[PDB]
Design a protein around this ligand. Structure first.
Ligand SMILES: *[C@@H](C(=O)O)[C@H](O)C(=O)N[C@@H](CC(C)C)C(=O)NCCC(C)C
Length: 212
């Protein structure tokens, strides 16, 4: 795999979003990976619906958190609408998939990256954007304004984000706290520090859609 991977350069990443005060990061994270894999496999870059996963993923808890795995599993089971057809409201509402017409995209499953393994994460990212979790509760992370982020931060993962690239000393993360945070909405987190958890537990739980 290359030394640098940036899915934004390859046209596989939609504008950065802001999840607002709703703990829908899991769905935002899941949606980045879906948009990515559809671009890679179809050539088309579309925005897909976070709101639809928020409303319809019944393993998750809407605005009270949830699981990027289960959201990815839903899109492999049912599919996902375009964001335009099922726009984000920042509140969980009743599930409207059926009422919005045929799904706009569908994947063929969900694979987990072997956890606590930097290489395996990097091999996934080299193939497509990946959903990852990390510890975001620290002020250093909340107050991040640029540069390769090295912490301080523990490994108590509580936030779902999407890894859309990497380089020799970092993994490139797309956050869902709007453009006004980090590096135009992104963070570069240090890698290759020998911590099996990864900086901010970045190697805790990583998933990605499968599309044939
Ligand atoms: C994340 C956010 O920053 O909006 C949101 O709070 C969330 O879904 N967090 C989850 C992280 C795991 C996927 C690692 C989470 O805590 N999920 C568990 C669901 C309940 C909160 C128990």
């Amino acid at each position: 795999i290359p030394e640098y991977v940036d899915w934004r350069q390859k046209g596989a990443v939609t504008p950065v979003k802001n999840q607002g005060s709703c703990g829908s990061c899991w769905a935002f994270s899941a949606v980045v990976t879906i948009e990515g894999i559809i671009k890679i496999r179809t050539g088309n870059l579309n925005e897909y619906s976070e709101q639809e996963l928020l409303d319809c993923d019944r393993r998750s808890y809407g605005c009270n958190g949830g699981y990027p795995w289960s959201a990815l599993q839903l899109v492999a089971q049912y599919g996902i609408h375009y964001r335009n057809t099922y726009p984000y409201e920042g509140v969980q509402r009743y599930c409207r998939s059926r009422e919005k017409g045929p799904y706009a995209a569908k994947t063929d499953g969900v694979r987990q990256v072997q956890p606590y393994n930097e290489g395996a994460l990097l091999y996934s990212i080299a193939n497509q954007p990946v959903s990852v979790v990390l510890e975001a509760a620290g002020k250093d992370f909340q107050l991040y304004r640029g540069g390769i982020f090295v912490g301080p931060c523990g490994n108590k993962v509580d936030h779902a984000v999407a890894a859309v690239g990497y380089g020799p000393n970092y993994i490139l993360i797309k956050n869902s706290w709007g453009t006004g945070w980090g590096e135009n909405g992104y963070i570069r987190i240090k890698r290759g520090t020998g911590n099996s958890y990864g900086v901010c537990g970045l190697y805790t739980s990583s998933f990605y859609p499968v599309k044939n």
